Symmetry: D2
RNA sequence: GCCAUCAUAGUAUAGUGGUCAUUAUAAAUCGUUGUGGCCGAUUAGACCCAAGUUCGAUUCUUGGUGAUGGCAC
RNA sequence: GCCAUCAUAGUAUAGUGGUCAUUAUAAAUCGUUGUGGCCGAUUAGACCCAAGUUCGAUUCUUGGUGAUGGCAC
């Protein structure tokens, strides 16, 4: 054929072999999404259950996924160094992960929220990106990074929304109130001003969600400083 | 943060400026999908209407898409040379398209097929890839390629399914029958043995589907040899 | 063999077909190089003749190079868009261009400077990079860019070195003298203080060197605003 | 400037952090090169000494090079995983390595071969490629691969040339004689038919040349099966 | 890494130191009718990239690139 | 591209040709209770990358990388 030549312009990226692969998916414009569908704030439990359901189903479908961590609108999946899925093609992996997360999210949404049918102009969408890590210490530091981010964002949001919801403040007002404030200040604001003990908040909200292949087990725990949690799971490294 | 350093391992791909971008999305394992949901064969009208609906909605959402051509389980989107969406990041573009096509397909499926609710183990999934073309001649030759592919595949499928359904053959029998057969043989088989004139088959089935930005207009026409079709639409080149 | 598997870790990058390739080579640490070999200042004629000889030899050896422009320690090469050399493998092209430039430079140095044999710790070395340009306007703008750089640097260096040699100023003094000065001021300083008319400077020094495939002809001319120079040479475009 | 925008078309490749980098340089068309300058066959000592001298000089110039292995016209360089040279830019590294090897070879050739001045149409040129290895076992296996390749190729050329010289065979005759033969067969052919004991051949010829940072020490030894050789050198790993 | 063979239309195939350089399909237009099928007619499409030899090179000689077949890890 | 200035802990900040090299926040454990908040105490972490000079270099001299501020398209 005289038109097939265009196929030669395509460029495939084969991810470096024997390297841990992390795929992170993140919901597109989930702020506006949370606004439209009236999520409970700071954290909507059922929505996170939809996310976790999607992640668990996906992880159940692909044996190569060793570990999953997610919070808010994001989820990260660790693939074993030797994973041969789609011959380690970056494009296949990423677009497939985004498609799967989107569709699973839609399905489990139809299951958890029959009262809120999805509108065509607001559908859950996710991006996805692949990152290569040559050493497991970097994997540990990655998930540590994600959990710390969950910590910061959840604290910020809880203080913010308690200022907005429990107090009568405006989003702008609450935003300006927290400017240049650090974690300790946020907690003090929560207790003294909002009468809220952050430590008593749900373990899922503050620590995030971990899905591990053991069986697929779900935990909400600190993975940052607990070495024994990792040591007892050597198959993650292999 | 002591853990944020991992962000340095990410490698982004910014697509070459002033170049036409074609994003092709394709349904994952849609043969089995067509069997599970009992699609009409050779071509399922309503399924094709779902595809076209998803594509039209997506194209309507993003102004940078100048032209779209799709058939069967695939759809191709042409972005203007000057499209800067997401800083021309390949990962963002592809994962976003796969997610959007997946969700739009799910929605329009829920609309066209209320009788066939989607099963969790069968959801429509799509991959997506970005290909760069430096000159418009390559764009024309690309879409020409896709339409030729549509012609061949549709002819094959119509002949095949007319052999299994009409002549009451098994799929393997039709497979063996069409082994080593050429277009003339397929037309003659359809005509003489199945009593079917291919030219009278739906224009959408044999020519595929074209959605072009003019209002968004739908055509089923030959774009291969009709130069005037392209000439009359200079904004595609710009 | 049990050790060949490592070959799978190699990643080749094939440059987009039908695209103009510009390979730019630039001498590594040629300031120190020019100091070491006691180059004439502001401009050493024979060194630039070595550069030009090397470039001309390379261009003579590989027919795909349509045009070459170089000045100071750098040289840029335009490859026809349809160039299939080394299957458009980026690494092969770049490392071979740098290697060729280095060796040819060494050779022509041995010919032009027999009095100055090269020292093992100062050898001419070059880097090389490949750049893709989808439209010829970008090629024109590139060579325009390079020539403008040649003008600016030549004017600055001529004024500076005339201040150092003729006015016997120290480099730091001449440098402070030129602070906040513009082209008119530099020309005025040269003519009134140094008794030098810049307009009378060698065409090679101010305009750089252009080697174009006609037969290979060498020019020192303005290619920026002269459109007819390009128009009369359509084969550069093809 | 209105012309600087072209700089935006450049694409840099930053090699993945904390990964071992192997840069392999290989002489361009060195068969013809060896023929032109009338190299001793099967192995020319002085030329290999030029190669080794160039490599040792290069390794001496860059402290990041931990180990080098070369034979025939090829040389491989191992960079510590944490090497930051040129910010791990592939282009800079490869073009610099090819340029340096080319120039160093040119220099040492004039030292070893004053009788054979280099011809402009035959200058030593080298390509260079970068490969990333995430684990040291792959490094061990890489150098193992190169040494085995050296053994095999040396066996082939020595046997062929001995069949030509001792038995006065025609190249086609020697070629026909070696058809379907394996290493053991080649050794047996050499000893029985050509009257040459391969085991008595130069250690450089059979094992290649190893340059390791200890001081820079040169060895001709087996690194494939000797584990203690690697174990005693932990600094190679880090 | 080595030798042998080879480089032509979208694909697949014959030929030449010298006319508009073959043949078969595929492609484009017209006509007939069974439709885009079969048949008849017309049109369109190429000799890897350079140097050198020569009156003239797709040919011959050289170089560079690229591919297959063998043999060997 | 030019010049000035600068390179330390996760961040932000003092000082030295020579002891375990500051201080303030952030982080880790214990303790108090109002909670992971305030406060007390204990602990953890670093001087861009090489060479030369030197007994000894984070400091000086040189070079390479990176960043900011001014001036210029």
């Amino acid at each position: 054929s005289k038109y097939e030549y265009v196929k030669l312009f395509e460029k495939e990226n084969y991810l470096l072999p024997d390297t841990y692969i992390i795929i992170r998916v993140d919901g597109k414009g989930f702020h506006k999404f949370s606004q439209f569908y009236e999520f409970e704030k700071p954290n909507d439990l059922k929505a996170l259950q939809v996310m976790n359901s999607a992640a668990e189903k996906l992880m159940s479908k692909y044996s190569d996924v060793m570990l999953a961590y997610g919070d808010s609108d994001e989820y990260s999946f660790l693939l074993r160094k030797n994973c041969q899925l789609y011959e380690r093609r970056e494009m296949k992996l990423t677009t497939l992960f985004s498609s799967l997360m989107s569709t699973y999210y839609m399905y489990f949404w139809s299951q958890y929220f029959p009262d809120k049918p999805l509108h065509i102009d607001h559908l859950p969408n996710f991006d996805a990106r692949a990152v290569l890590y040559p050493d497991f210490k970097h994997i540990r530091n990655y998930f540590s990074w994600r959990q710390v981010d969950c910590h910061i964002n959840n604290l910020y949001n809880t203080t913010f929304w308690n200022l907005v919801l429990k107090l009568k403040m405006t989003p702008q007002q609450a935003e300006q109130r927290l400017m240049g404030t650090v974690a300790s200040d946020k907690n003090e604001i929560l207790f003294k001003e909002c009468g809220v003990n952050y430590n008593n908040e749900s373990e899922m909200y503050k620590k995030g969600t971990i899905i591990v292949r053991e069986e697929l087990k779900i935990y909400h725990v600190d993975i940052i400083n607990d070495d024994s949690w990792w040591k007892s799971r050597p198959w993650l490294k292999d």
